[PDB]
């Protein structure tokens, strides 16, 4: 079912998180973390205290989808991440503790109705690294993602 899902989307905040690689995502869906450069570390701090879940939609460049989402359930605090050409390590080095909520990709092609008030109404796949996506749009989004039945909501909303 869907409902478990909604009431942890509920008065959410949404934010696009770009991933230069799929290995970096694919070892945050292994090890739960996840690690931004410092102005969107920063941005995701505050917003953390701001709000009762904090919603991560990752997609990795080039893909042409989503890969999934997940609930921050942790400010950063200071993994063998991949980085970009020039980008370093102490550009990652804040680490959040995240809660999958979906680990199943969707495409773009998928979200093509849907735009972001944030971003002068783009597509909401549009986007940088650590775009705020408004709560409306943000909910559709992530209620257009296959269900992940290997995924209990139970505990995501007891750390709520
Ligand atoms: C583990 N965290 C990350 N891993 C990877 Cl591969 N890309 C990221 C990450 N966070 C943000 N981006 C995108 C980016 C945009 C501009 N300059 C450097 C990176």
């Known amino acids: 079912g869907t409902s478990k899902l909604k009431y942890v989307l509920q008065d959410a905040r949404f934010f696009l998180i770009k991933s230069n690689n799929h290995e970096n995502v694919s070892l945050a869906k292994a090890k739960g973390v996840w690690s931004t450069l410092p102005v969107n570390e920063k941005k995701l701090n505050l917003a953390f205290r701001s709000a009762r879940s904090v919603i991560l939609i990752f997609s990795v460049r080039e893909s042409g989808k989503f890969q999934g989402f997940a609930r921050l359930s942790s400010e950063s605090h200071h993994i063998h991440w991949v980085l970009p050409a020039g980008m370093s390590a102490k550009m990652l080095g804040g ?66």
């Open 95 to 160: 680490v959040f503790k995240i809660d999958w909520i979906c680990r199943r990709e969707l495409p773009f092609t998928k979200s093509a109705h849907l735009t972001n008030p944030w971003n002068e109404h783009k597509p909401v796949k549009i986007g940088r690294d650590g775009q705020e996506i408004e709560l409306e749009c943000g909910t559709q989004l992530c209620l257009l993602f296959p269900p992940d039945e290997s995924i209990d909501l139970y505990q995501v909303i007891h750390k709520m």
